[PDB]
Subunit: 456 residues, 3 copies
């Protein structure tokens, strides 16, 4: 017997379609090559990023823990596996008691005694109704779950490494942008000083100019700090130092990511690792019901022997001192005070809990992918507008500087255009960061980067 | 015996009063109907929200896990409960050994053997000094704790659902506000273009105008994204789709929430579920001391029988083969190497730990409610000022546009007034969101929304 | 025997040096007095903070849990310790069975029986190959780990208390700054009203002025809220009320912190408590290998007696009813179905897992200190620039107000200078907060504030 219930994978409690509305492109339906199947070496066009990910998979201690845990759980399966087979040792026993007259063989106070090197099993449980086999398959599903948890952990690592790298690249651009800008404010301030010296620019003009310089200096210090803290974050996720002979990277203006396709909600159940994870736990919960069911049914047990017994140690390995034992022990529970029913309620409840966690994982997955698509339907429009804003801000700036130098107009307008230009450029860098990050996370949420190369 | 210590609920280590200072309204003292007692159907005036909460309580997988866990722990109580009663089975034994001559009945190598279908108990522990009863009441308090954890989980769910909904409603307003505003910037830009074509507005004016348009376009894309991600967040907390025939909602200008009263700090100990939770764990810790104390005291045990024994299987259900057994086993420990004292130290330490966690929960609760009241004493002033800022910003805007069109004044002033108006309106929406959120959280922290209707 | 493997502390998988680059001061190399050794009473120059920390160490429930847990784990060690010594009780047994004729002494259905108050041990495991001693030293390392976790918890508490206090002091300054500023906007608005009444200032001027007033009012309400919520946060971390007779504090302009030295990366392995923590867990993992190894080797066991036995209860404490028992039981496993190998794989895997967690803790520590130094190499430049920005902003303001009052220039410039001044001052307060916080955290990450006074 196996008393394990049949397993029916529960109904995905999400909509058949990903959402629609103003924020999303049209649903692309079924995907020839699911996003879960696209290798990260392919998804990440930047060759420098690729190597970094590689380093991280080799060296990152959290992922290393996740792989070790797969082994831990296999070892656990191997323990339960062994449990269906008899433990056989060499049991060298030896009683030597003094009894009183009213209990002795003689009738006066005697000293009886025995000895016995044997070979056999004690209390071997014979798995007729399948308590152990159930516990075993429960351990197997848990191993399988832990296998999925590793893949999950990897996809999380890939996403974090790419993000840490992109964040670095962003802040490096902010810093460089700030460098150039400070140079320009210093230049403008010097021109304005020569003008003030010569009688033309006002003290107010000069203070305004100074104001732009100092604000830019402060931002410079900030981004210098952020760039460095980004490297520290990346080195941590790598689990070792930044390699010394990287290929050249790609700038954020270039194309960094492969378009990965939406797929259908239903692909998550076959392809996202933490959903499979949760499913395995459910199947483990389900196997544990078997165990609790078997506790009702009769329970075979067995001690078995062969060896040499004697009255004194000296007669042990002497001819015809041979000994053996054979002893079955069938047991059928009849009255628990509900204990066995309660243990069975417990196991079913545990299954129900895992149904619900499995549903949850599905729901979470939907939400994250939906959000990914909300980003994908909106960031192209946003960057396009933000780029227009930079361009116009820049035209605004060119005019305002000219109108100021020429005496035609005031410093306040120049100051206004300078701020507008600098904040738009910073913001443009951030928007591009956020849009890259949304796709990275979308790739992770579809089923991510477990594969190095695309699987056909 | 029960060797469980008397339980004295520890002293609430918080101030008798909620704080005072510039940030708070006067303490309202004792509350006729404690906030914990106000049903969410009453606290939440918005009928659309009400249904959404309802959907969430039916469908949310995390709360479903919490309820299942209550059952899990009841099942656990039922196990310990059963443990004070004898396990009675049908134990069909059967030895068959070969002994040597110096051990046999004969004096030459013999094969002895027995068989015996019986009915009785093995090693039934008789609970004189109460080890089991203690373990049992420990399981009962844990069940009670888990009951409180569900209520806690519900109050967390109510708070999150209301928040997710309000956040949606806020972003919907931001989006609509942005829509209108873009329309106005487009309109202004077109007017400024006709003016430029006709010789009047300057190129600078035109660039400035353009600048407002593009910034507004970018914000539009952003809020379109946020509105959608908000729906995704709400659908997740609901644990199913947004229903298809909702009542009409209420706008954020309208009255959304019932005024809930402060109460006294002391109400938290009778009414906040995670404080009661922590208390039950403390009472469970306390019950476990009983268990460890009993390990010192003597320990009755019992095997009992009735059945049919025989020398061969064939004589089992034959007349007068009747058999029975009765066997007590009192045991008083005398020398542990401190083990039993250590086990008792452990249990007391575990109680102390739970005293401290119970105190903590109280302290956390105080802090959260205090913060709630800091919000309640300040958000009315803040919104009032922010509304004034909108009004004045709007007057500022009307004038600046007029002065610009009329040639009386420059585009920079118009641009300044346009930004001031738009950021104040956005900020006003956010402030109202934050103030609603503070009360929602305050309601949760007082003891929340476990009840559907107000309890009298 | 101890079958525990030799322990080699793993190689610190971080760079020999802390990072260099634009963000960092030169590496200061080895430190005469490591930062871990500087007492918090010394590191924190503010006497009011010092007392607050003191209060927190006395009263904070989380740290109290951490200390109790050290005791819990010592108790656990004491349990395993006791396990190498024999449990000796008083075992008052007593069988009374009815057998059938074919099993009885007589040959017809008899009722045999025995009784026996004794004193001795049951199944005392004799630790030849060291299963128990291993389990014991595993419990000792776990105790040691938990000891380190307390220190860690303290250093976290010190850092949080200082931070909560600084955050309070910051917001108090923001609030005061806002108070003064509002006073100035009200003053300016009144002057502008008298000007408008008298025919000179324009309606636009007046609206602009109003705008500054209302924005300042809203900020006032906000910081009033934040100041209070900060106190609530501090009171929580203290685990009791704010004392009633504090020394006077220090303002944020003053010197608050001792310069703590970098040290070398290598100091973290001897001095950061959670790294030592992780090491102890590793040494515990390592000790558990011993246990699993011993399961292969033979296994001595022993029951021993002295007492009084009899055929009837009435003969127990009668002369020459003396009884005793002596019974060894050596056992060597021969066939497991790989179970014992699997259990040994498991224990080694568990060691490997702890190698990796130990490495991780080191890596995390490096990252946090590196970040600390990135702050230390950049915040002096940043504050210096931000201070310049305040100064210039203030000059800008003085001029703009003068040029406005005098009819020489417009309100927009005044408005611009007013915003620039107020946001720079707020920002300056925040930067100073962040820079203080970085050093506080840097001190914590080096090895923190376990010591009250500097250790020589």
């Amino acid at each position: 017997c196996s008393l394990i219930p049949d397993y029916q994978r529960p109904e995905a409690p999400v909509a058949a379609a990903y959402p629609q509305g103003q924020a999303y492109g049209q649903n692309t339906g079924a995907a020839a090559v699911p996003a879960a199947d696209i290798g990260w070496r392919e998804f990440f066009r930047d060759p420098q990023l690729q190597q970094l990910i590689g380093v991280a998979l080799e060296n990152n201690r959290d992922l290393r823990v996740a792989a070790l845990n797969v082994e831990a759980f296999r070892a656990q399966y191997r323990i339960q596996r062994a449990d269906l087979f008899p433990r056989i040792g060499v049991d060298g026993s030896g009683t030597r008691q003094r009894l009183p007259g009213d209990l002795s063989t003689t009738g006066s106070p005697a000293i009886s005694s025995q000895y016995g090197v044997t070979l056999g099993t004690t209390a071997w449980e014979l798995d007729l109704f399948g308590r152990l086999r159930s516990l075993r398959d429960q351990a197997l599903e848990q191993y399988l779950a832990t296998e999925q948890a590793q893949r999950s952990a990897q996809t999380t690592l890939v996403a974090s490494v790419a993000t840490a790298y992109l964040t670095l690249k962003a802040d490096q651009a902010q810093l460089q942008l700030t460098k150039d800008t400070l140079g320009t404010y210093q230049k403008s301030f010097d021109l304005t000083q020569r003008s003030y010296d010569v009688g033309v620019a006002s003290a107010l003009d000069l203070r305004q100019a100074q104001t732009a310089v100092e604000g830019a200096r402060a931002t410079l210090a900030q981004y210098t700090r952020l760039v460095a803290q980004d490297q520290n974050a990346l080195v941590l996720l790598l689990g070792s130092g930044i390699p010394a002979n990287l290929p050249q990277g790609l700038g954020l203006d270039q194309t960094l990511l492969t378009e990965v396709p939406a797929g259908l909600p239903s692909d998550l159940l076959q392809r996202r690792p933490d959903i499979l994870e949760a499913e395995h736990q459910l199947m483990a919960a389900n196997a544990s019901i078997g165990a609790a069911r078997a506790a009702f049914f009769p329970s075979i047990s067995l001690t078995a022997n062969a060896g040499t017994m004697s009255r004194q140690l000296s007669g042990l390995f002497d001819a015809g001192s041979g000994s053996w034992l054979f002893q079955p022990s069938i047991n059928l529970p009849i009255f628990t005070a509900g204990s066995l029913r309660a243990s069975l309620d417990y196991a079913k409840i545990q299954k129900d809990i895992n149904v619900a966690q499995y549903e949850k994982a599905i729901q979470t997955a939907f939400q994250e992918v939906a959000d990914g698509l909300a980003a994908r339907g909106t960031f192209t429009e946003q960057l396009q507008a933000q780029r227009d804003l930079v361009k116009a801000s820049d035209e605004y700036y060119q005019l305002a500087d000219k109108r100021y130098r020429t005496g035609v107009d005031n410093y306040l307008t120049l100051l206004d255009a300078q701020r507008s230009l600098f904040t738009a450029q910073q913001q443009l860098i951030t928007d591009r960061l956020n849009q890259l990050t949304s796709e990275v996370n979308l790739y992770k949420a579809l089923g991510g980067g477990w594969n190095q190369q695309t699987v056909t």
